Amino acid sequence: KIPFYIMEEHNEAFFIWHYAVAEGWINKNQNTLLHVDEHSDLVVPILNSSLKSVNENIKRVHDFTYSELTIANFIYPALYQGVFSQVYWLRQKHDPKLNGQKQLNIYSHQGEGKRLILKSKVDFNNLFNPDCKSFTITPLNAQDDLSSEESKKLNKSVILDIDIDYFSCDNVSGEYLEVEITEEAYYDYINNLYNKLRICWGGNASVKYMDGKYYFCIIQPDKLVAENLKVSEDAIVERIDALIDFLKVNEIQPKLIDVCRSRLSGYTPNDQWEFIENTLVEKLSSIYEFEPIFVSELSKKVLV
Amino acid sequence: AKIPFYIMEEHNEAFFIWHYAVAEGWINKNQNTLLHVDEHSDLVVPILNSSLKSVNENIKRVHDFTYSELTIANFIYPALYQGVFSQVYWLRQKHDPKLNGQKQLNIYSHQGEGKRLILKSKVDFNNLFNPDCKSFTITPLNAQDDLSSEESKKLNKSVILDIDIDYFSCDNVSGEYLEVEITEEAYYDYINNLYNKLRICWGGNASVKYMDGKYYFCIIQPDKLVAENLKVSEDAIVERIDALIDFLKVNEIQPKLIDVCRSRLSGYTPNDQWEFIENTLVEKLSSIYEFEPIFVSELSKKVLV
Ligand SMILES: [Mg+2]
Ligand SMILES: [Mn+2]
Ligand SMILES: [Mn+2]
Ligand SMILES: [Mn+2]
Ligand SMILES: [Mn+2]
């Protein structure tokens, strides 16, 4: 049986990886992240906690995961800790400019493990620096014919990290961020000349009134440049089958599989997420042996 | 002849002052130089709800737009798109070493509507004779720079002296700190729900706080202690004001309009220094220029009548 885990939001993947190392399902380091997602999740985080200290025990990892980790900044931390030595990002259609391997290195400011710094060329000072980790991020497609040399390089301690929004996505519902505010806060935003929030926070940011309630729209997606990434149930099935073929052809045997719904964040359509998860698990069960366990089960063992 | 001199609280108000200066005829409609003396570039490209073509119609319209869609960092490119300035010179204490020489840039609006601004490094073939497309330069400067006669000649044309007092002494941590009053429901969902969208999207870059029976959502800097401190001493401030006054004398700068921004309500200028910086700056500017400083409120007064 392959360890198989399902989470609501992607930051939880960090907790699952460290749990797997603790139980010994995957190795301490030199693992491969097969990151199957519409988004790269390669935001370089600044953290309050040192990633050196977070690693010590699983209870500390759990608290960090649901505190400082976002749904787009959870990979570079795992790379800085040396959990993965190479990342393969699988997408429906990649940007044309970005193609082939990318030789990168990550270190923290003054070795504190708080402010991560990304570089293409390894600095002379970071030569034989334990803080500095070298790795490669590669853009792949499910329809890519992979060479015998490239196939060998990918197939080393593989973690199959799948976000359901890979198959069908809604960036408009996903990007949109709001918080309910008081009438006093709403009024000051519009009418106060020097309301810091209006004149210091740009983009599409706004305040709105609905149902006798007030909201600060922190982030509104640009609907003019928004692509229609929501596809039919047939297109989803086709896309899931294409992933199975990529895994079959490259003879991928994961040491850990994790699935992210991304339906509470709204990136996966709310009327599809059940169909995509159910169909994926069915299709994954045809080539792999596993028992799907919800991430809550891991939390309960840690909290007690 | 006195130089029109206007003091404002926040930098978005500069846009209003520039268009007022055009309407009165203190400066020309176009081909002005923006001498931008500030710690921050204020070169955010804004996507707007109002067309910048329509905003320019009358001064009331400009005033409404300034206190609506503008931020303290996106007020320059709208003025460049409207053709108010043909070149910007950014005066900073210490620039990025990579940033050298004049940057040949052009700005145009999506479909010529004047709502969505698009910034480019080279003029697109379609925008070669397009009157919606404006060509300009943005150049870094230092107060210690000795300009050539060719350089000084190029720069010293219809100058607007645009000073943000955060150039002399700055606090980016105080300036970047934002908080908004939220409801009980919003506060307790953030606290109890692990999948609350504010939590999972922003993590340690945001937080919530309870103060005097009220709830706030706060945008915060993680590892705040390690963040840079640009707050300097009064002596350093005086030395830096003298350095500017010397640069203005040496290059024989005679501004058609001076505007000063406090940035103390936004908190970019330290609250214990802003009065000292402003008073010293105005005192040492009067040693090389003749003017009577007027607060931006007096301009707003006339428009709303
Ligand atoms: Mg706005
Ligand atoms: Mn993801
Ligand atoms: Mn995703
Ligand atoms: Mn400014
Ligand atoms: Mn400034």
Residue numbers in the entry:
A (entry chain B): 3 to 306
B (entry chain A): 2 to 306
From the study:
pmcPeptide arginases are a recently discovered enzyme family (pfam12640) catalyzing the hydrolysis of arginine residues incorporated in a peptide chain to ornithine (Orn) units, constituting an unprecedented post-translational modification. The first characterized peptide arginase representative is OspR (OSCI_RS22075) from the cyanobacterium Kamptonema sp. (formerly Oscillatoria) PCC 6506. OspR hydrolyzes two arginine residues to ornithines in the precursor peptide OspA during the biosynthesis of landornamide A, a member of the proteusin family of RiPPs with antiviral activity toward lymphocytic choriomeningitis virus. Peptide arginases are weakly similar to the well-characterized family of conventional arginases (EC 3.5.3.1, also known as l-arginine amidinohydrolases) that hydrolyze free l-arginine monomers to l-ornithine and urea.
Here, we report the first crystal structure of a peptide arginase at a resolution of 2.6 Å. The structure of OspR reveals a three-layered α-β-α sandwich arrangement, which is a fold shared by all arginases.30 Apart from this similarity, the macromolecular assembly of OspR shows major differences compared to other arginases. As confirmed by analytical size exclusion chromatography, OspR forms a homodimer in solution. The dimer contact region is almost exclusively established by an additional domain (residues Ser170-Ser234), which is absent in conventional arginases. The narrow region occurring in the center of the OspR homodimer forms a large surface-exposed cleft, which presumably acts as the binding site for the 10 kDa leader region of OspA. The base of the negatively charged cavity accommodates a binuclear manganese cluster typical for arginases. MnA of OspR is coordinated by His12 and Asp43, whereas MnB binds to His41 and Asp167. Asp39 and Asp165 complex both metal ions. Interestingly, the OspR structure features an acetate molecule that is bound at the substrate binding site serving as a mimic for the guanidine moiety of the actual substrate. Furthermore, the established arginase mechanism features a histidine residue that serves as an important proton shuttle. This histidine is replaced by Ile73 in OspR, a residue which is unable to perform the same task.
